[PDB]
Ligand binder design. Sequence first.
Ligand SMILES: OC[C@H]1O[C@](O)(CO)[C@@H](O)[C@@H]1O
Length: 516
Amino acid sequence: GFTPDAPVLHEIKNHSEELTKAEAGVAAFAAKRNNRWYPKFHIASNGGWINDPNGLCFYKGRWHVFYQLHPYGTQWGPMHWGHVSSADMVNWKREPIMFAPSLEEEKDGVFSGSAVIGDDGKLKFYYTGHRWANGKDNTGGDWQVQMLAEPDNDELTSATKRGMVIDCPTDKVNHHYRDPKVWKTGDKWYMTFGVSSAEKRGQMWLFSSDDMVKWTYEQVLFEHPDSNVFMLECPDFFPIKDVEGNEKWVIGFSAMGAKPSGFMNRNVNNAGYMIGTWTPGEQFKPETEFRLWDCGHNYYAPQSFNDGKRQIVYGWMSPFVEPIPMQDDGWCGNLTLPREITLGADGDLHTAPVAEMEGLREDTVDFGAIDLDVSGEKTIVDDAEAVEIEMTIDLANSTAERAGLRVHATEDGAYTSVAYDDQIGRVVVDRQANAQGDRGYRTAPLSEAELAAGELKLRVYVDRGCVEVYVNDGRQVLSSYSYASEGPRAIKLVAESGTLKVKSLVLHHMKSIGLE
Ligand SMILES: OC[C@H]1O[C@](O)(CO)[C@@H](O)[C@@H]1O
């Protein structure tokens, strides 16, 4: 039906020529870039817009990160895959752009996808080919199919497109049909991607293969129970051992259309996961409610991959809300740090940074224990461009109603706050005092156990244009853009409306990952 016996190749452009055009676009932007917010230790394009992480793998001794790339502007546009790699996850290098639209079935965009090591030890790429359904523009909705490509070399500098391996039964779906992941379970290969059903419900479809090339429709692996959710972008699906040592499955997706409620689903679209069980032949059986990967302002389209031992996840720091002032600066968007996924005794995922992120530290400045015996502030450093702050708050002996750090604390009185808030029992990233961007605040919940524990650990990464806040060794994370003003950028320890006892505060200067 819609699963060809062999890959369908409809070459319409010279791939090498379209790649060369794309290199010029990103290089032109890079040369005129304003570095005020450009990351020192996060992955961005050298120029232009990025979104979703793609093709994540550890392959032939190297860490690979690809990403949705618009080479020709700082807003979303004709989609390419950019590429960076590393031997150690600390020191990165720019690779040639990997994919530009060159086949009929992808002529309006090379959309998101994944990479997986086959039975022969060779990598395969699976990605979506995008067409405008009306053949013109977005007014008529999307026309999307799944594509295969194979690397030309172990370095993944280039790939040969094989063409379309799964077509779209256009009249059985609501346009959205994208973002494949391929994995092996037992003696079968499986593929999942996101679909808007004919009834406009968000679904993940499942296909199987003996050879990773010819696919068979199996069933709908999962449908989102919220009728407001019409699409599941960037689906994820992987096994992980629970505390009992039983095998669970994590389903993840970037959900479109859920309405906000209290603190929950506040971003325009929201990415999250459920933990449950899966037997091949059956649908996913959730055992949890939907939970956000990241509770911050700017996080979407996460993808995970396995390095042989660890399941590792990157998110795109998504700016969905105007104004987006970095779009004036010749780049837009970066990825988060890579996070190791663990499943704790608390029955939830933890996403601490991978151990390699300690290699970002140039130094360790130990400020020791700090007591604010009255409401007030203490400057930790007058200027911080790119730092990691580790701090332990003594909840039991602090009366402050709100306590933590002000980062990007500039001479104009602007700052971003990272605080424990005793009135809501949450960690809060508050951008109210940002001089630019859409401001607002984001909260991460603390369990009854965490609130009763009498200490709270924060690990805060401050880059030129963003913050990443790891709570209690990655039980929760908040990633937000932070639009620092001109001049020195202080870090202050602040106690509002009472006392603060900090058991430990330690600063590390962050090195460049070599991509700027
Ligand atoms: O750039 C297009 C890509 O971005 C997403 O919409 C999610 O951000 C994916 O579903 C799509 O493949």
